Each structure stands twice: as structure tokens, then as C-alpha cells.
Design a protein around this ligand. Structure first.
Ligand SMILES: NC(=O)c1ccc[n+]([C@@H]2O[C@H](COP(=O)([O-])OP(=O)(O)OC[C@H]3O[C@@H](n4cnc5c(N)ncnc54)[C@H](O)[C@@H]3O)[C@@H](O)[C@H]2O)c1
Ligand SMILES: NC(=O)c1ccc[n+]([C@@H]2O[C@H](COP(=O)([O-])OP(=O)(O)OC[C@H]3O[C@@H](n4cnc5c(N)ncnc54)[C@H](O)[C@@H]3O)[C@@H](O)[C@H]2O)c1
Ligand SMILES: NC(=O)c1ccc[n+]([C@@H]2O[C@H](COP(=O)([O-])OP(=O)(O)OC[C@H]3O[C@@H](n4cnc5c(N)ncnc54)[C@H](O)[C@@H]3O)[C@@H](O)[C@H]2O)c1
Ligand SMILES: NC(=O)c1ccc[n+]([C@@H]2O[C@H](COP(=O)([O-])OP(=O)(O)OC[C@H]3O[C@@H](n4cnc5c(N)ncnc54)[C@H](O)[C@@H]3O)[C@@H](O)[C@H]2O)c1
Ligand SMILES: O=C(O)c1ccccc1CCC1Oc2ccccc2O1
Ligand SMILES: O=C(O)c1ccccc1CCC1Oc2ccccc2O1
Ligand SMILES: O=C(O)c1ccccc1CCC1Oc2ccccc2O1
Ligand SMILES: O=C(O)c1ccccc1CCC1Oc2ccccc2O1
Ligand SMILES: OC[C@H]1O[C@@H](O)[C@H](O)[C@@H](O)[C@@H]1O
Ligand SMILES: OC[C@H]1O[C@@H](O)[C@H](O)[C@@H](O)[C@@H]1O
Ligand SMILES: OC[C@H]1O[C@@H](O)[C@H](O)[C@@H](O)[C@@H]1O
Ligand SMILES: OC[C@H]1O[C@@H](O)[C@H](O)[C@@H](O)[C@@H]1O
Ligand code: NA
Ligand code: NA
Ligand code: NA
Ligand code: NA
Lengths: 258, 258, 258, 258
């Protein structure tokens, strides 16, 4: 309840899923949290539920929404210590020939450029507080995924960008790290599974993709984020895997040497 | 002179630098090579110089230029075996606060979406030939670089996209790999150094960034590309480092524990 | 003071340096800690200083010392929740031709087989508690170091072994992770620098090997260890870098393309 | 037939499997090859079959065997350009509690220290020729494997050692690289499968562990080795994956978030 007391945190896409788990973790650590989301329903309810959290409607693809998010955070709370760039989307499975350049651009706008824009606008305040940036990337940026060429590309970009910004901001004492989750049970995971021919089979396969034999929880990503913000003072430019071991060992990757 | 005989290769940005080195390597391997470049000067001269190479003016950010590149390759040579996505640019050093979202978008168009578009248009022909894709990424997509947030992000995206496409195309026997060069002495390296306060000092530091104590050559990237195309039949989704060991060991990263 | 309350932790090489920092972090988290060290001086003083810590003399290269360490931990505290394999050594800089197979074997005994032996003897108790293993590896296992072939090999082995054991123990709910520190200011760092022609210059170079421009502290490694034990329930088989960004970006690796 | 003409190559464990594939690749490249193996049957037959290959009986765990291997290579052929450290073994699947420290030591002697010893004895001659070292590691050193803690540890050590030695030998122009194969169909793979309850099912699972849907061939590892020796002049300290994409994407790693 005190490991991040007195600090101010902005969490994008904080209204549900991983984002909401991160919001809860920071509130439980003693921080004041600004919940940003493009949808009102979940975030407004979270503000009512959590003392110390407030909701600001903000679409991270709209530069002027983000400018207002930062200026309102400063106006209302007087400082900014941590930005968690969690807002993002995973399209339904798409074969490469079914993707389009314009859809790829749209996904870059959310998953990459929204993170870039908030980080840019926040950095002057993070420099004053020697604060930090946490980007939510994905394991599939590192190892790939089938039927997700645009999505994978956007998360490879986020992870690499994290390292570049870590280098640039290190002289100011501002750390920049990312978390790469694997399969986390969220409303988006459930929505994507519902599109599949056999949603139950898709969910079971998702559980068995981890040696631990289950998917992860938003609270587990949130704990990793609170660690990076509050106790990882010699960590910058790292990719913290929260994946249950999915990247480890041999598995079933195809549907003796010729 | 025969390890890739009878094969047809498209190299983007092939008029100078790494691209020209890759063109020469494939011609020396027995392949017919289509040189794509947005500038005429170097590529036209290379066609005249190299039997088995032809030049097609093509800006990879212009979807209709790329469609014509593919249709002309097929019309003129009857097949397509390998696409080398080398066209790309590195901006001058830019602090994060000096970058813009619109400049970031423009760099994504070249370094990422041009690779995406040519690959998409070529894949039906690569499936017929069980051909392969080689993307030219960068070491800095993996380890970051200072004063290059947009550039680093684009190359992290290329490397990740390579793995995603490798997964999607594996059932068709089409391999997708990337080469991540470190410091290669090219006209772009020389142009970037010329912008610096002490170009000679910048070049010397660039040589000493490798344990081998020199920069690499376009011919060395070209040899790696010919290997991936012609002899790496069990390699897909790999990142082949051509860096002289720059990623190894401790070095000077800042300008005792507090 | 409560995030790991009621838990029992064994820290090898806990008498000074990183090990002592890890001991302090776990005591501050509410755990009871068994300090193992082959030397009495530091560990005995730490027991006197810290309520909740006790010292057991134990050389991790001596299988019967380690058996007694585990049986005494269980006899005295009734459970075992976390083993931190920190005991290890870095020889003075040695050129490859100056190393010997027998010295390499001796270093494997400490840095690798001591970790293996304690982990093996502890695992039946860790299974009962759904506890976890934390191995202290090194960044140089991942990126190499000059004049340290045997040492680097031992830490590459520890990091890989961590992943293998994570796979094997995942069905039992026992997580296995490692921390890879970079330059941490410890008595061993100071001892190694004292051997050099210009110790002050060696220390300054060690500080500048990180973008953050300083070395790390034992307390920072300790915080990472407490995170892995207490709050990283979906992390297994990970390598948590505590390096200040030393692996990022280009640096000086040698003492333009030919 | 000329890309490595005039060069002399030593391949350990060259009598069958990957080693024999590497021997054949180097002979086909124009090199003279010394086949080292502890068993006579396969290697003696290979000498008879291949002009330009000779067989020397040599157990790489016996330091005096290795000294004789190097001195006989020099006596007979006058130079040494490349050492391929391929000799190694994978034990049957073993749960961690079924392993022993003494078995772990024995496996380190072969998989790690044999590579170390030959490399050490060869380096004075490799310096004279600006030759290179190729170590055969494994993908599982990087990602782990179930029921193979000692084996995985030895290959993590080989990969890390490769990078350390690359750093140390870079001032002399001697490159040191490794190849990490995934599932390669060899007599050892077949022997290991024969131990399993359902060998046919084990082999099928091994094929499906790669997105390419087959295992690799010794010839494919051999081609990668010839590339590293003959055409990778700016590559040092790299890990060249020859895995068919096994490390990519999600798969089946266990036998929704709790
Ligand atoms: N769930 C997983 O398994 C998983 C795995 C790896 C990475 N991730 C990443 O974690 C993040 C959250 O994923 P999730 O599963 O919780 O998703 P989710 O869809 O359940 O929640 C995302 C939230 O972000 C909000 N959001 C979307 N677009 C926005 C925009 N333009 N501006 C502001 N808010 C916006 C949504 O309204 C929603 O509240 C994403 O970046 C995703 O790529 C998720
Ligand atoms: N030189 C290095 O050290 C280095 C290191 C890592 C990666 N790379 C990558 O290698 C590639 C080539 O780099 P280089 O140093 O040879 O650069 P370069 O500028 O010397 O050559 C690039 C070529 O691409 C062409 N090109 C640029 N934009 C194009 C477009 N829209 N359409 C078609 N052609 C276009 C240029 O006209 C030029 O001929 C780039 O992708 C770069 O990011 C270079
Ligand atoms: N200091 C760094 O920069 C650094 C960096 C990366 C990794 N590491 C690793 O961190 C660990 C601790 O390093 P440090 O710098 O604190 O070293 P240190 O020498 O200061 O402390 C190590 C402690 O381990 C004890 N120890 C040594 N051999 C032992 C044995 N056989 N049995 C029991 N205890 C034994 C020593 O007596 C000492 O108290 C080591 O594994 C080292 O490889 C250190
Ligand atoms: N087959 C695979 O899928 C695979 C995958 C990854 C790595 N590897 C590695 O590739 C190498 C070769 O594996 P393989 O499958 O061809 O094995 P294999 O058992 O078929 O062949 C290995 C050869 O090495 C020889 N050898 C063994 N011990 C020796 C010693 N002490 N001295 C000299 N020669 C010795 C054997 O007699 C044999 O001829 C090993 O290092 C192995 O770890 C294999
Ligand atoms: O991994 C990611 O980054 C990710 C991000 C957001 C949500 C879920 C994930 C996991 C993979 C996702 O989950 C699916 C379910 C059904 C079909 C396709 C799916 O892909
Ligand atoms: O690494 C890359 O991908 C890359 C790509 C194209 C060209 C050169 C490079 C190397 C780094 C580059 O070279 C510079 C020289 C002067 C200032 C800044 C520089 O950055
Ligand atoms: O990195 C490691 O794992 C490590 C482990 C223990 C202690 C220190 C280190 C850092 C490198 C070490 O510090 C040196 C100082 C002078 C000469 C050589 C040195 O190497
Ligand atoms: O991956 C490696 O390094 C390796 C090395 C040598 C031989 C084979 C391999 C693949 C894994 C191996 O193949 C098995 C088959 C049956 C049971 C267990 C097995 O493990
Ligand atoms: O919708 C799937 C899951 O999403 C998570 O974000 C919620 O915390 C869970 O309550 C829910 O079961
Ligand atoms: O301009 C720098 C270098 O660029 C390379 O692409 C050319 O092959 C070299 O001749 C030239 O020295
Ligand atoms: O000896 C170097 C450093 O070692 C660390 O372990 C101690 O905590 C410090 O007090 C000391 O300055
Ligand atoms: O024994 C399995 C395989 O081993 C390989 O080394 C041989 O080249 C093959 O002929 C054989 O099928
Ligand atoms: Na509230
Ligand atoms: Na021509
Ligand atoms: Na005490
Ligand atoms: Na012969």
C-alpha cells in the first residue's frame, strides 16, 4: 500500500482487461491513477470503484485527446511519474493475403503511434520526476504468431522502440521498459476465441500453449508493472516476459527429414 | 556461378550500397536479377555492367509501382524465386522530442510497408517456385540505437514481421528470413557521418563499435543473402546477424553505484 | 514487510555482495532467511544484525554440506519456499591460452554444479510449498565477455539450465527463473579492479558500460529476486536483466571496411 | 567445388550424423578434411569414400588424443583453417531427480570441455591462417528442453563460450561462431526415439515441432557450416539457427487463468 505512494500513473486502455489489472495494481501500491480509455463503460465504473483512480475519456490515436490527457493529469494531480502504454488491439486471425496496407496503417496508429505520442507528450514531466515508461508489447513480437502479420509487426516495433527510447532518456534518469505478455485471459481473448469454429477448443489450446497449463491474469501483468515502476531502478530497456513459459521447449508448430 | 542458376531475384534499393552488393552476389551465383530503385543513376549503370541484371524504376512506397515491378519481372523472366527487401532509409540522428508522428509514418511507409507490399504481391509467384523472402532489417532493431526512435521501431517491426510471415508461409514451402547488418560502409553511412560535427571521429567510432575493428562490406551482406536463398533450406524465420560482433561484450554506453 | 511473510528462503553466498543484498530484501519482505556461505565472517554478522536471518556454514561444492543445509533448514523452520543460487565466482581476466581444463572444471563445480546440487536437494520441499528457484546468472552469459571464457561458459549453462528445469517443474507448480546482473558494485568487483594496472580507470569504464552511467547495487538485485519469488506467478524460465541497459546500443568493442 | 579450396578442416564426431554431413559439405567445397571420431566404423568408411578426407581415431575427452589430432593434421596437411566441434551426445530423457552430478560432469566433459580443448590446441594454427571455429550447439540451449537438464546446460555453455572466444580472438582475425540445430534426423535421433514407448509417435511429434513439418538433414547443417567458414567474414560470435522454425509461434507445451 506504500511502495508507490505519492506517485501519479497514467494507464491507457485501462477500462478492462490487462489495463484494468494494471490500474488496480497501482492503486493497491498507493499511487493515484488516471485511467485513459476510448470507451466510457468500464473506466467510469473503475473510477467509482477505486479511490485514487479517475477516468479521462481519451482515444490514444487522436493527438489532441492525448495532449488533453497529459495537461489534465498535471492540472489535477501536479506531477506525472509513470506512463503505462497498454491500449492496443489484436485483429481476428488474418492470412497474409487477406491483410491490407490500410488496415496495417490503422493498426500501427493504435498499437505503435499512440504509445509514441503519449510518451512524447509525457516525457517533459517524467524528466522532472525521474519517472518511467512501461510499454505493453507481446511475446509474439519476439517469436511471431500465425495469421497476424500486421499485429506482430506492431509489437516488434514497440519492443524495439522501448530500447531506443531507453537509450535516449537514460541521461535524464528516465527508465523505459516493456512487458511482453503471452496468453492472458481478457475480454479480447474471449472475443477472439468466440470468432473461431470451436471456441472451447481454441481456449483449451491457448491454456496448453504454456508449460504452466493455464493462461495468465491481468493482476499478474499489473504486478510486473508495479515492479518496473517502483523497484527496478537499474532496469532500463528490458523486455519482461509474463508468458507462463510459452517460449520454452519444443511444441506442436505444424499441422522424417523430407 | 551455379549455386542459384536458373533463378530470378528481385532486389529493392539495389542501385547502390548494400542493395548493389546483394545484386552482384546473386549475379555471381548464376541468377537473373531485377534491380528496383527509386533513383535511376546507380541502377541503370549496374544493368549495363552486369549481364543478367536489369533495372526497373520503382518506388516501393507506391503500390502501383510495385505491382508493375512484379508483373514486369514475370513478363520478362517467367518466374520469381527470391525477393530481397533492402530499400530503406536511416534519418539523421534525432532526439525523441525532435521527431514527429508524421515523420514516423513516412519512415514506416518505406522501411516497413514497402517490404510488406512487395512481399504480398510476390507471394503467389514465390509459392509456385517454392521461393523465399529475405528482409534487410538492422541490428539496432534488436539492441536499440541512440537518437533513432522511429528508425529502430521500423526495423523491430521488420524482424518481427519476418517471423510471422515465416509461420504463415511454411505450409507452402516458402521460407522468410531476415539479415540484420550492423555497421556496413555504404553511401548512406558516409552521408550520415558527413552531417556530424567531426565526421572522421564518427567514422572511427563506427569502426571500433565492432570487435573486428572495421565496418562490414556490401559484399558480405550479399553473401549472407545468397546463402539464405540457395542453401538454407531448413532456415525460416531466422535473423542472421552480419555485425562483426557489435552486440557482444561490454562497451562504452554512457558519456560507483549511485 | 508482508509480501513474503511466512515463507522460508535459502540464499547461497549470502554473506556479502549481491547475496547479502538479496538476504536483506527477503528479510524486509517478511521472510525467514537461511544465509549459506563458505566463509563465516560476513554471514555470521548478518545473522546477528537481522532478526529472521540465520547463518549456516556451507560450501556449495560439497554435496554433504548442501544436504545438511537443506535438512537443517527444514528441521529449524519446517518448510522451504525459495532457493536463491547466488554463490559463484569470477576469476581474474584470463586470455584463452592462459586457461586450463582443470580450472574450467573447478569453476563449473561452483558456478554450475553447486546450483544444480542445492536445487536438486531442495525440489522435494519446493514441490510441497509450490515454491520457486532463482538462479543468479550474468549478462555475460548472454552477450559474452572478453578474457573470461570459462566464466562466461558457466553462466550460459546456468541460464539454459534455468529454462530446462522450468519446463520439468512446471507440472508441479514450481517456477524456476534467473536474474542476469550486469555490473554490480560488490566486493568481488572491487577485488577484480584492484588487480588491474589502473583500478580507477577500470572502475570508471565499468560505470560507463551502462547507459545509466553507474553500476548497480545489491539491493536492486535483491528487489528483483523478491519480485520473482513473491509476485511473478506467471513467470517461469525467464531471464530478468538487471544491467542498467549495458546490452543496448552500439559502444566501443575494439581497441573503414577493411 | 572451389569455395573453400586449399583449406584444411577438422570435424569432430565426423563419422556419422550431422558430423558426416559437415564432412561431406566441406569436401564438396574443395577442402581437405580430417574426420575425428571415437568410433572407427563410420569414419574409416568415409575416408575410403571421399578423396580429400582422412580419418583419425580421437576421443575428444582425452586431452592427449586431441593433441595428437592437431599435431597429425599439421604434419600431414601443413595448415589448419577451420575446426568444427560437432562431437557431443544427448542422453535419454531423464527427469531432474533422476540425474546425477557425476553424470552431469561426464556430459560436460564431452559436450563442453572437448570443444574447449580442441579449440585451445588449434588456435595457434588458426591464428596463422586467420581461420575460424564453428561449434555445434543446440536450439535447446536457447529455449530449453524437457527431461534434459544436464544436456541443455552443456549447450547453453557452448553457445555462451562461442561469444566469449569470439571476443578474445577478434584482434587476431579468428572468427568463432556456432550453429544451433533443432530436430535433425540422425542415428542419435533414431536411437533416442527407439527408447520411447511409441517410437513412431515420438518421431511424428518431432517432425511437427517445426512449422516446416519435417526434421532437418545433416547436409543442411553442413551447408551452414561451409557458409560460416568460407563466406561469413563479418560474422563472429553468432548463433546460426538451423531449426525449421521450431522456436517460432505458440505451440503445445503442457499436457482458463487458474
Ligand atoms: N490478452 C493477451 O493475451 C495479450 C497478450 C499480449 C499482449 N497483449 C496486449 O495487452 C494490451 C491489452 O490487451 P487486452 O487483452 O487487455 O485487451 P482488451 O481489448 O480486453 O482491453 C484493451 C482496452 O484498451 C482500450 N482501447 C482500445 N483502443 C483504444 C484507443 N484507441 N484509445 C484508448 N483506449 C483504447 C479498449 O477500449 C479496452 O478497454 C494490448 O496492447 C494487447 O496487445 C494482450
Ligand atoms: N549501412 C548500414 O550500416 C546498415 C546497417 C543496418 C541496416 N541497413 C539497412 O540496409 C538497407 C540499405 O542500406 P544502405 O546503407 O545500403 O543505404 P543506401 O542509402 O546507401 O542505399 C539504399 C538504396 O535504396 C534506394 N531506395 C531508397 N528509398 C527507396 C524507395 N522508396 N524505393 C526504392 N528504392 C529506394 C536508394 O535510392 C538507394 O539506392 C536499408 O534497409 C538499411 O536500413 C544498413
Ligand atoms: N558483481 C557483479 O557485477 C556480478 C555481475 C553478474 C553476475 N554476478 C554473480 O552474482 C553472484 C555474486 O557475485 P558478487 O559480486 O556478489 O560476489 P562476491 O564475491 O562479493 O560474493 C559472493 C559470496 O559467495 C560466497 N561463496 C563463494 N564461493 C562459495 C561456495 N563454494 N559456497 C558458498 N558460498 C560461496 C563468498 O564467500 C561470498 O560471500 C555470483 O554468482 C556472480 O557470478 C555478479
Ligand atoms: N540430431 C539433432 O537433432 C541435434 C540437434 C541439435 C544439436 N545436435 C548436436 O549435433 C552434434 C551431432 O549430433 P548427431 O545427432 O549427429 O549425433 P550422432 O550420435 O549421430 O553422431 C555423433 C558422432 O560423434 C561421435 N562422438 C561421440 N562422442 C565422441 C567423442 N568423445 N569423441 C569423438 N567423437 C565422438 C560419435 O561416435 C558419432 O559418430 C552433437 O553435438 C549434438 O548435440 C544434434
Ligand atoms: O498474443 C497476443 O499478443 C494477444 C493480444 C491480445 C489478445 C490475445 C493475444 C493472444 C493471441 C491471440 O489470442 C487468440 C485467440 C483466438 C484466435 C487468435 C488469437 O490470437
Ligand atoms: O544501423 C543501421 O541500421 C544503419 C542503417 C543505415 C545506415 C547506417 C546504419 C548504422 C547506424 C547509423 O550510422 C550513423 C552514422 C552517423 C550518425 C548516425 C548513424 O547511425
Ligand atoms: O559480469 C559479471 O558476471 C561479473 C561477475 C562478478 C563480478 C564482476 C562482474 C562484472 C565483470 C567483471 O568485472 C571486472 C573488473 C575488472 C576486471 C574484469 C572484470 O569482469
Ligand atoms: O535437440 C537436440 O539438441 C538433440 C541433440 C541430439 C539428438 C536429438 C536432439 C533433439 C532432441 C532429442 O530428440 C529426442 C528423441 C526422443 C526423446 C528425446 C529427444 O531429445
Ligand atoms: O473476460 C475474461 C476475463 O477478463 C479479465 O479481464 C477479467 O478480470 C476476468 O474477470 C474475466 O474472466
Ligand atoms: O560510399 C562508401 C562505400 O559504399 C559502398 O557501397 C561501395 O561499394 C564502396 O565502394 C564505397 O566506398
Ligand atoms: O565493496 C563494494 C560494495 O559492496 C557492496 O556489497 C556493499 O553493499 C557496499 O557497501 C560496498 O561499497
Ligand atoms: O539414421 C537416420 C539418418 O541419419 C543420417 O545421418 C543419415 O544421413 C540418413 O541416411 C539416415 O536416414
Ligand atoms: Na475514484
Ligand atoms: Na544487364
Ligand atoms: Na538473526
Ligand atoms: Na579419402
Amino acid at each position: 500500500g506504500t511502495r508507490y505512494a505519492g506517485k501519479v500513473v497514467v494507464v491507457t486502455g485501462g477500462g478492462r482487461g490487462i489495463g484494468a489489472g494494471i490500474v488496480r495494481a497501482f492503486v493497491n501500491s498507493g499511487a493515484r491513477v488516471v485511467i485513459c480509455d476510448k470507451d466510457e463503460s468500464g473506466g467510469r465504473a473503475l473510477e467509482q470503484e477505486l479511490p485514487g483512480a479517475v477516468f479521462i475519456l481519451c482515444d490514444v490515436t487522436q493527438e489532441d485527446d492525448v495532449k488533453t490527457l497529459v495537461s489534465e493529469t498535471i492540472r489535477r494531480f501536479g506531477r506525472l511519474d509513470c506512463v503505462v502504454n497498454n491500449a492496443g488491439h489484436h485483429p481476428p486471425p488474418q492470412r497474409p493475403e487477406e491483410t491490407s496496407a490500410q488496415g496495417f496503417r490503422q493498426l500501427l496508429e493504435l498499437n505503435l503511434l499512440g504509445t509514441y505520442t503519449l510518451t512524447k507528450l509525457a516525457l517533459p514531466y517524467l524528466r522532472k520526476s525521474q519517472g518511467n515508461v512501461i510499454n505493453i508489447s507481446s511475446l509474439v513480437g519476439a517469436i511471431g504468431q500465425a495469421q497476424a502479420v500486421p499485429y506482430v509487426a506492431t509489437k516488434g516495433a514497440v519492443t524495439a522502440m522501448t530500447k531506443a527510447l531507453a537509450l535516449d532518456e537514460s541521461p535524464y534518469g528516465v527508465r523505459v521498459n516493456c512487458i511482453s505478455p503471452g496468453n492472458i485471459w481478457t475480454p479480447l481473448w474471449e472475443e477472439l476465441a468466440a470468432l473461431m469454429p470451436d471456441p472451447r477448443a481454441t481456449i483449451r489450446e491457448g491454456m496448453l500453449a504454456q508449460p504452466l497449463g493455464r493462461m495468465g491474469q491481468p493482476a499478474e501483468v499489473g504486478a510486473a508493472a508495479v515492479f518496473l515502476a517502483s523497484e527496478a531502478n537499474f532496469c532500463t530497456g528490458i523486455e519482461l516476459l509474463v508468458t507462463g513459459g510459452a517460449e520454452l521447449g519444443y511444441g506442436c508448430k505444424a499441422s522424417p527429414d523430407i
